[PDB]
Design a protein around this motif. Structure first.
Motif, PDB file in Angstrom:
ATOM      1  N   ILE A 160      68.619  50.352  28.581  1.00 21.68           N
ATOM      2  CA  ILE A 160      70.013  49.960  28.616  1.00 21.68           C
ATOM      3  C   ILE A 160      70.705  50.899  29.597  1.00 21.68           C
ATOM      4  CG2 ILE A 160      72.248  49.974  27.564  1.00 21.68           C
ATOM      5  CD1 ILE A 160      70.977  49.186  24.883  1.00 21.68           C
ATOM      6  N   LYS A 161      70.576  52.190  29.277  1.00 24.06           N
ATOM      7  CA  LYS A 161      71.216  53.142  30.191  1.00 24.06           C
ATOM      8  C   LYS A 161      70.571  54.505  30.048  1.00 24.06           C
ATOM      9  CE  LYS A 161      76.014  54.494  31.152  1.00 24.06           C
ATOM     10  NZ  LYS A 161      75.478  55.221  32.335  1.00 24.06           N
ATOM     11  N   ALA A 162      70.384  55.195  31.162  1.00 30.52           N
ATOM     12  CA  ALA A 162      69.893  56.571  31.091  1.00 30.52           C
ATOM     13  C   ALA A 162      71.100  57.482  30.927  1.00 30.52           C
ATOM     14  CB  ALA A 162      69.100  56.921  32.333  1.00 30.52           C
ATOM     15  N   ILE A 163      71.117  58.394  29.962  1.00 33.04           N
ATOM     16  CA  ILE A 163      72.295  59.227  29.712  1.00 33.04           C
ATOM     17  C   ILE A 163      72.150  60.624  30.296  1.00 33.04           C
ATOM     18  CG2 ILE A 163      73.388  60.598  27.918  1.00 33.04           C
ATOM     19  CD1 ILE A 163      72.522  57.228  26.727  1.00 33.04           C
ATOM     20  N   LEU A 189      68.239  52.654  24.758  1.00 33.44           N
ATOM     21  CA  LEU A 189      67.315  51.541  24.839  1.00 33.44           C
ATOM     22  C   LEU A 189      67.658  50.442  23.832  1.00 33.44           C
ATOM     23  CD1 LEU A 189      63.829  53.363  24.751  1.00 33.44           C
ATOM     24  CD2 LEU A 189      65.176  52.784  26.780  1.00 33.44           C
ATOM     25  N   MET A 190      67.202  49.249  24.171  1.00 30.25           N
ATOM     26  CA  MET A 190      67.230  48.109  23.265  1.00 30.25           C
ATOM     27  C   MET A 190      65.877  48.081  22.561  1.00 30.25           C
ATOM     28  SD  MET A 190      69.551  45.786  22.387  1.00 30.25           S
ATOM     29  CE  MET A 190      70.531  45.610  23.872  1.00 30.25           C
ATOM     30  N   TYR A 191      65.905  48.278  21.250  1.00 33.49           N
ATOM     31  CA  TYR A 191      64.685  48.400  20.457  1.00 33.49           C
ATOM     32  C   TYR A 191      64.786  47.491  19.235  1.00 33.49           C
ATOM     33  CZ  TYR A 191      61.223  50.322  17.248  1.00 33.49           C
ATOM     34  OH  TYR A 191      60.170  50.467  16.370  1.00 33.49           O
ATOM     35  N   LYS A 192      63.869  46.544  19.117  1.00 31.98           N
ATOM     36  CA  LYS A 192      63.930  45.546  18.056  1.00 31.98           C
ATOM     37  C   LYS A 192      65.330  44.948  17.959  1.00 31.98           C
ATOM     38  CE  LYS A 192      59.792  46.991  16.398  1.00 31.98           C
ATOM     39  NZ  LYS A 192      59.837  47.300  14.941  1.00 31.98           N
ATOM     40  N   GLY A 193      65.891  44.520  19.086  1.00 27.95           N
ATOM     41  CA  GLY A 193      67.147  43.799  19.126  1.00 27.95           C
ATOM     42  C   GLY A 193      68.384  44.635  18.936  1.00 27.95           C
ATOM     43  N   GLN A 194      68.233  45.955  18.837  1.00 22.78           N
ATOM     44  CA  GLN A 194      69.402  46.811  18.633  1.00 22.78           C
ATOM     45  C   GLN A 194      69.531  47.866  19.721  1.00 22.78           C
ATOM     46  OE1 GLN A 194      71.978  47.710  17.391  1.00 22.78           O
ATOM     47  NE2 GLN A 194      72.054  49.912  16.937  1.00 22.78           N
ATOM     48  N   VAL A 214      58.481  49.361  29.573  1.00 22.37           N
ATOM     49  CA  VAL A 214      58.880  50.562  28.835  1.00 22.37           C
ATOM     50  C   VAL A 214      58.411  50.428  27.390  1.00 22.37           C
ATOM     51  CG1 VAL A 214      60.834  52.018  28.150  1.00 22.37           C
ATOM     52  CG2 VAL A 214      60.788  50.851  30.376  1.00 22.37           C
ATOM     53  N   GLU A 215      57.791  51.476  26.870  1.00 25.54           N
ATOM     54  CA  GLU A 215      57.343  51.459  25.476  1.00 25.54           C
ATOM     55  C   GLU A 215      57.788  52.738  24.778  1.00 25.54           C
ATOM     56  OE1 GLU A 215      53.347  51.012  27.009  1.00 25.54           O
ATOM     57  OE2 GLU A 215      53.157  49.413  25.485  1.00 25.54           O
ATOM     58  N   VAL A 216      58.051  52.629  23.478  1.00 20.24           N
ATOM     59  CA  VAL A 216      58.420  53.813  22.704  1.00 20.24           C
ATOM     60  C   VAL A 216      57.278  54.073  21.734  1.00 20.24           C
ATOM     61  CG1 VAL A 216      60.892  53.495  22.899  1.00 20.24           C
ATOM     62  CG2 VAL A 216      59.638  52.448  21.004  1.00 20.24           C
ATOM     63  N   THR A 227      64.313  59.406  13.274  1.00 20.21           N
ATOM     64  CA  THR A 227      65.641  59.627  13.859  1.00 20.21           C
ATOM     65  C   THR A 227      66.093  61.051  13.580  1.00 20.21           C
ATOM     66  OG1 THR A 227      66.955  58.803  11.976  1.00 20.21           O
ATOM     67  CG2 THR A 227      66.137  57.170  13.446  1.00 20.21           C
ATOM     68  N   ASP A 228      66.956  61.622  14.411  1.00 17.78           N
ATOM     69  CA  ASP A 228      67.481  62.946  14.074  1.00 17.78           C
ATOM     70  C   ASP A 228      68.830  62.832  13.358  1.00 17.78           C
ATOM     71  OD1 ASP A 228      69.471  62.446  16.045  1.00 17.78           O
ATOM     72  OD2 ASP A 228      68.602  63.862  17.463  1.00 17.78           O
ATOM     73  N   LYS A 229      69.472  63.983  13.148  1.00 26.02           N
ATOM     74  CA  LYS A 229      70.732  63.982  12.405  1.00 26.02           C
ATOM     75  C   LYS A 229      71.851  63.307  13.180  1.00 26.02           C
ATOM     76  CE  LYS A 229      71.558  68.582  13.890  1.00 26.02           C
ATOM     77  NZ  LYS A 229      72.800  69.116  14.507  1.00 26.02           N
ATOM     78  N   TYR A 230      71.689  63.086  14.484  1.00 23.15           N
ATOM     79  CA  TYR A 230      72.737  62.393  15.231  1.00 23.15           C
ATOM     80  C   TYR A 230      72.467  60.913  15.314  1.00 23.15           C
ATOM     81  CZ  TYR A 230      74.073  67.107  16.337  1.00 23.15           C
ATOM     82  OH  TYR A 230      74.449  68.422  16.246  1.00 23.15           O
ATOM     83  N   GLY A 231      71.440  60.474  14.579  1.00 20.63           N
ATOM     84  CA  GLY A 231      71.188  59.033  14.655  1.00 20.63           C
ATOM     85  C   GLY A 231      70.319  58.678  15.851  1.00 20.63           C
ATOM     86  N   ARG A 232      69.848  59.669  16.603  1.00 15.46           N
ATOM     87  CA  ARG A 232      68.977  59.342  17.741  1.00 15.46           C
ATOM     88  C   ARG A 232      67.520  59.162  17.334  1.00 15.46           C
ATOM     89  NH1 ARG A 232      70.339  64.232  21.762  1.00 15.46           N
ATOM     90  NH2 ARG A 232      69.896  65.343  19.795  1.00 15.46           N
ATOM     91  N   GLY A 233      66.924  58.101  17.878  1.00 17.67           N
ATOM     92  CA  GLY A 233      65.502  57.864  17.677  1.00 17.67           C
ATOM     93  C   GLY A 233      64.708  58.979  18.342  1.00 17.67           C
TER      94      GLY A 233
END
Length: 136
Positions: free
Chosen positions: A10-13, A20-25, A67-69, A77-83
């Motif tokens: 989706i976008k590199a930060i 990323l778009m992962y399983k539709g989210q 792209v694969e994860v 996920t971490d405490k900030y909600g990041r995968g």
């Protein structure tokens, strides 16, 4: 046995963080086990090799066909909600690539999310030996 799953950029930060778009989210992902110089560092600001690490991650993922994860065996996920994952661009691990080029250090490792730690540490010793970027 870790498994790869497909994802869409989706976008590199920043060098270590990508959306990323992962399983539709739409999701923010933090690259496991690496620390890149920051462009969005909470306290300092723009650090040396930050723009570089950040352009590397962007180009590497933007120019990929696939792209694969890959999640590790602990928390996903971490405490900030990041995968929390290993990210692959056409079969090549972005996390290792950054370390191999001297644009990332191997982070402090929290078991059990440490499956590729030895590989990355070996890539980091080579970049050091070669005195690349961060190591020059």
């Amino acid at each position: 046995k870790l498994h790869k799953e497909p994802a869409t950029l989706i976008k590199a930060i920043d060098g270590d963080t990508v959306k990323l778009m992962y399983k539709g989210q739409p999701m923010t992902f933090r690259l496991l086990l690496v620390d890149t110089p920051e462009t969005k560092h909470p306290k300092k600001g723009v650090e040396k090799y930050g723009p570089e690490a950040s352009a590397f991650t962007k180009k590497m993922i933007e120019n990929a066909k696939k792209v694969e994860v890959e999640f590790d065996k602990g928390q996903r996920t971490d405490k900030y909600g990041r995968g929390l994952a290993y990210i692959y661009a056409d079969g090549k691990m972005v996390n290792e690539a950054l370390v191999r080029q001297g644009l990332a250090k191997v982070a402090y490792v929290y078991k059990p999310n440490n499956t590729h730690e030895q590989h990355l540490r070996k890539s980091e010793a080579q970049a050091k030996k070669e005195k690349l970027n961060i190591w020059s």
